[model samples]
Target: KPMFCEIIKLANRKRLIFNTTDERVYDARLNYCSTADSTVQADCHIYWRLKLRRTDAVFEEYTGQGYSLDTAAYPQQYTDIIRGYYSKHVSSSLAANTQHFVNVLAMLRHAGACIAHYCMTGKIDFDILSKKKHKNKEVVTLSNADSLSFLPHSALYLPSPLRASDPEIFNMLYLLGCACDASIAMDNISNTSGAAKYSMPHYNPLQLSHALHVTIFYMLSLMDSCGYGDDAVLALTSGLHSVTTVIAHSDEGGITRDALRELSYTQPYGTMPVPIAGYFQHINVLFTTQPAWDQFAGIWDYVILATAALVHLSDPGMTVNDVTYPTTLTTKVATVDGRNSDLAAQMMHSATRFCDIFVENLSTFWGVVANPDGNASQALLHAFNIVACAVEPNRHLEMNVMAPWYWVESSALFCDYAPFRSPISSAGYGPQCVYGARLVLAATNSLEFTGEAGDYSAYRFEWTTMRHNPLFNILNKRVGDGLANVDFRLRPFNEWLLEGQPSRRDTLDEYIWGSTSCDLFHPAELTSYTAVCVRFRNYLSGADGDVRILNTPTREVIEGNVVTRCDGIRCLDSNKRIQHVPEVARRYCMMARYLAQARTFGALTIGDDIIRGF
Candidate 1:
């Protein structure tokens, strides 16, 4: 009999236990809420915990411990047990957001598949683990007639039959056509229908443009990884041109084309200019080259090209004629055509400069990505670095000056300080100083301390400063203290603060403490806090002194002579408190701006009748 068989027998007999002393069972049972006549709740946490532990042990034995068994040799009872666990718990676990268990089960299944494949073929099939599939099915080539049924009716002349022969490329084109059709349908309905009878969701052209931009990048990355960069680029560009041409010539009012054209003409908020014919040509040549493709430089080219294409497709009228050449920085700005020109020309000039910076700093970007600690943050920093080169300073500088003053005045108004309220109408002198103090406090709290005391002191000072000037106390009254009234605007922030601040220990830690300490020794028998209790003779008094030195316990020793010996208590630390004051301030300000813009757009679309009447 195998180890798995014994595990299955134990599970069947209800004897298998993982974390037997887990105390969470009691609280879960006590705090369990349901409607009247609900079935009695079982100890779900313990059951799943035991089930997972048993499964893991079985998998380890099969794979790692040289206890590998053939599928036919493996006990039917063990297989049944695995299936029964999934059937009983998968749905409920997913509903409860415990989908991590499902993922673990999936890994177990995959491992089993891999082992079986290895046994049958004398080699593991790597393709079995590949998740690159359409609708959970492997890619299958379709005949021209079958493929024609899926392709757009007007899309007759593709680059080649080979483009459609590849299932992935065919699928990509098909999806793009469908997305365009959906956008066109949305536009038609919005034009013909009245707002009273029907409402349609706004389908922004930028949405699809960005989606395709990312889709192209993803395809390029996959190809580069698979050592088929040139072929992949060719296939992608061919498919894109075929689909775009079809949509552009469509009789359905050419809505997507017009949208793209309008987007190209519009001035983007960011410094990067729209894609032009030059970008498309540049990417084609750059990617198709043998050396560039071999060095995986095609991946970088694809990213830049796709972004420029996204902006270009968004608007077609933004020109970049004299701005083709890149700028080199010295101490002072050099004379160049359209360097101090209008916004569009300046943006185009910035785009060329950005490309030059990207090429020059490629090694630095690669270094960041190749670092051991590199992750999404490294990627974000690279993107930020690229964008920062092109970003104008004054726009962000204005916000930096305005944001803190706005927050300060808002806080003052919420507290109802009479003198502060009068100064709110005027541009005050001390706002910049208040903002500077906030930055200092933020840095101090983040760097110096890991405890709540640092954050609490900072917030206290901020609240006080917002109410009264640090320069002078003219009234000498306590402005921010003992607030009986709170404005409606402050209600959300107060609620958020209350909701966010709690003991940092999650349910797992709570359960562990409850089981190991409280369940083993009753609450009265154990000390309330974790500490190393010491018994020592006081030299001065000569009497025996017993003192409890509070510190975080490393582990629990339940069976030891806790009363007589210097024993450490095993209580969970509740000192870790959430500090989110700065988060709340920044996030709420963003929400306010977003909601205001959303309301403005809603009013613009629905008209005054809906706006005023509603």
Candidate 2:
């Protein structure tokens, strides 16, 4: 007879069979297999198979309903937790962000060397990396203990003597930014040091920690030296400080979310102040003042205008006319409020005038620098020239035209040549000779004008060859589609016959003139020396033409070639287009040769002085 059995059921749908006579428990669902014996436990296999099937069913249910690996599927709180962890511990940890800072310093160092070399020798060496091997291979390691001591002292030294004014500080900062950019480009050539060495092997965690400390110290120094109460400077200083602080504490286990929150309350990386309106307002006032045509006054205007342009580009407001060309070609009209509404054309006009005046006053201008006179007037002139040469014009080009067109339609007038003309006249059609000079100025701003790194976007604007900068594709597309397409007109050639015909042009001649002008002035697609030589040749040609008429018996020639060519003197007839173009071209070539050498070295030295306290 079979042993008497008692059945028991579990909440998990498992049944246990108890054999009363044998005093043993068995699995009821799997042919009454004994639970205590392991060898013949068929129920265990069934239990596992059921568990696997249930798991597969659950997975399939979620997957069939379009569940994905995307983080969006997770709860917001959970996602935040995970992201916060990654940001603090993994991606943007102290080590990672510090690496970025060190990388920036490396760039600055390379750039400083390049600028210094150019200053000393009046030549740019493209082979920066080739010389990198010669760099003092000493590893600069700063301890955490040293940083703790350094920062407090740096902070204590607040509000030092202001050696430079707001504009000067702004200019130096911009040059430093450019230097960093050039260094980045140089590194991309062979993917060597600087920005290219950001991989794991090159990373030093201690350096990251040290960099944060040093950067903080340097920022504090900048805060004191930079123009007091300048919104932009303050914002940069504050933002950088907060960012560095957060990065420094990111990896610390004790840093809670609330604790981090207390450190940086709101958008820690401070916003770049929007001084666009104020800049435009001040520029308009300067225009209205119509200051006398002193070189110093003229340069101040140019500097103001350039600053306004930079501020405008940094944070463009609803002022549509600034960035985009108008639907119709009309003369710039004054607003009822007395503000100049046409800032873009006005800026271009200012740039043209600056180029004009700079060329016009070249000889006496250089005389002031060459002959050291301690007069306040002479000192001011030298200072102004330094400021003017340091200003980059490619940024101006970014606001004006697109890529191919900058080269293709080199002679086209994109803005009003004169301030206020009701009906646009022939005088309105300005050639881009000055624009070309601006390009050369930009090219000289960098150390490596011709190299593999020349293709980098930072260097591409004034590169030694024509190549599309992939970075500006979106900007190019906008310009191509916008009013720049229809508004741009070819400047009329100064031929005897075409003098009367401003509206009519020969298509074939237009193309020829455009191509010829591009060949003449566009620095891109030409060697640096070749570009300088061609412009110099043109200047001499203009000078020769000016001199030919001076010898004519019928010509009054108040400003003769002899008067214009006087050594160590100002040219009295420089306002004349013939004289203006020649002098401007000469100045352009001179700057291409020496301005970078002078100003870059000055900038580096000034920058070094500012950070020396740290």
Residue 480 shift from truth in candidate 1, angstroms: 29
Candidate 1: global Cα-lDDT?
Answer: 0.20
Clashing pairs in 1: 23-515, 263-314, 263-315, 264-314, 264-315, 264-316, 265-315, 275-312
Q: How far is each candidate from the true structure, as Cα RMSD in Å?
A: 28.9, 35.7
Instruction: List ranges where model 1 is wrong by over 4 Å.
Output: 1-160, 163-165, 180-614
Q: Residue 104 error for model 1, in Å?
A: 39
Candidate lDDT scores, in order, read 0.20, 0.19
lDDT of 1 at 544: 42
Model 2, residue 433: distance off in Å is 24
